[PDB]
């Protein structure tokens, strides 16, 4: 399938190389971790790469299932 | 300027 990249280019769903069997959604905190919450760096991965402390990652196998929720003014 | 969890269009500041 294809995944969007918030961490590399701007944001576009491009097919990924061999290895990541699906897409994913990571979250954490940018350079200063502001009050705007964390970021939303989805992309590709072999499997839900979630880990231990605050690395909150997720997955996405449907078509363009990596569109985090943010396009909307308060 | 990010795709943070509160907007998507690259914001300046």
């Amino acid at each position: 399938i294809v995944c969007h990249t918030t961490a590399t280019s701007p944001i576009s769903a491009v097919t990924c190389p061999p290895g990541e069997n699906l897409c994913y959604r990571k979250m954490w905190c940018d350079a200063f971790c502001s009050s705007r919450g964390k970021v939303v760096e989805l992309g590709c991965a072999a499997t839900c790469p979630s880990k231990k402390p605050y690395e909150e990652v997720t997955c996405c196998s449907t078509d363009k299932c990596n569109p985090h929720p943010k396009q909307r003014p308060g | 300027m990010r795709y943070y969890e509160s907007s998507l269009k690259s914001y300046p500041d």
Side-chain angles (χ1 to χ4, degrees), chain A residues 6 9-10 30 38 68 70, chain B residues 2-8:
Chain A
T6 20
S9 322
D30 204 60
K38 325 320 207 76
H68 51 119
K70 354 60 33 211
Chain B
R2 268 178 209 307
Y3 338 82
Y4 240 61
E5 73 169 44
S6 158
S7 180
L8 194 280

Side-chain angles (χ1 to χ4, degrees), chain A residues 26-38:
Chain A
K26 246 166 255 245
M27 245 180 196
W28 34 48
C29 238
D30 204 60
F32 276 132
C33 197
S34 293
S35 317
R36 312 303 234 211
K38 325 320 207 76

Side-chain angles (χ1 to χ4, degrees), chain A residues 2 10 22 26 31 37 39-40 52-53 64 66:
Chain A
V2 194
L22 62 121
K26 246 166 255 245
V39 203
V40 197
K52 283 112 167 187
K64 294 178 171 179
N66 246 209

Side-chain angles (χ1 to χ4, degrees), chain A residues 34-51:
Chain A
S34 293
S35 317
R36 312 303 234 211
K38 325 320 207 76
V39 203
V40 197
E41 311 239 42
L42 325 113
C44 309
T47 60
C48 303
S50 235
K51 280 262 70 63

